[PDB]
Amino acid sequence: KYQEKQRKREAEERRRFPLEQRLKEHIIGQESAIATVGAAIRRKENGWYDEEHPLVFLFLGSSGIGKTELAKQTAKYMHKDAKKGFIRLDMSEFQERHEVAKFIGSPPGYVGHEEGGQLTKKLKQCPNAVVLFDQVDKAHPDVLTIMLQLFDEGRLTDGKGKTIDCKDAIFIMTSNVASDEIAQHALQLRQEAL
């Protein structure tokens, strides 16, 4: 009964000041994006999410319109100032196929094998973290192939063989792919609306 009362109090707190208003404090415009991300996180927090497959976003758009800002504020909403629950990964560092060792460590018999992986360690520290793969398009696509296991089922086996469950994580992927096309189509639609 105490757990149900605490859950109802948390639900009333979220209904009083949801993620949409908390994002509208920081983010300006992007009402479609705030609505999409808020509806998805509302589906997650109210228990209406498939617990097997993690929630995965791709933020597309022009430069400096709140992709990384909305991802950061989404992480701050889910975990407050806890740095464990916001696994930032600047994917412009991952421009070559062999940069997956940062994710999954190194195999046995190689340098850096004892340290293991970086993302797998950070997700061991916080399985339900908001992992921000910032600028995902700037990485090699073969490096993004590692994210298949991590997006379909939330698993990422390190160099030492230790798999980590990451199903509750909220993966966010900022990218400027088709930024010119999205910007031109939005400007065209605004001209037609005017």
Add this chain to the structure above:
Amino acid sequence: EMSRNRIAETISKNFKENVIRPILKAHFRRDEFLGRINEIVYFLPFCHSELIQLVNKELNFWAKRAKQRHNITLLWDREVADVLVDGYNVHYGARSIKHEVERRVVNQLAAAYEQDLLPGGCTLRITVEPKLRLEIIDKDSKTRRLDIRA
């Protein structure tokens, strides 16, 4: 043109947005990289007064080296600056003035120093003959040209 017309009687934002912005976008291929830059600072070429100031800076540098290392008070007229400005290349910039000073002035100084035609404390006036020529001074009416052999 406007100055002489009035006597007879700054890079603009549009240039940055219409000319330089497409060139930067073409080279760097990413507006996200350019939008992170706070100040795209524009360095313009040198005006003629700035070329004279560059020649004076280079000649003062060699004068300070001559005074410190060897105690040779180097001197020069404004005509020396006007002569050495003619070796300025717009494409190369201030490096052209440094190379021109090293060609015309300092090769002669080095050849004079190797030949021991520049004792300590002596004054030395670079003078336009236009070929520059060194002139050692001892009194208020003695200026013999240094005969630098090959």
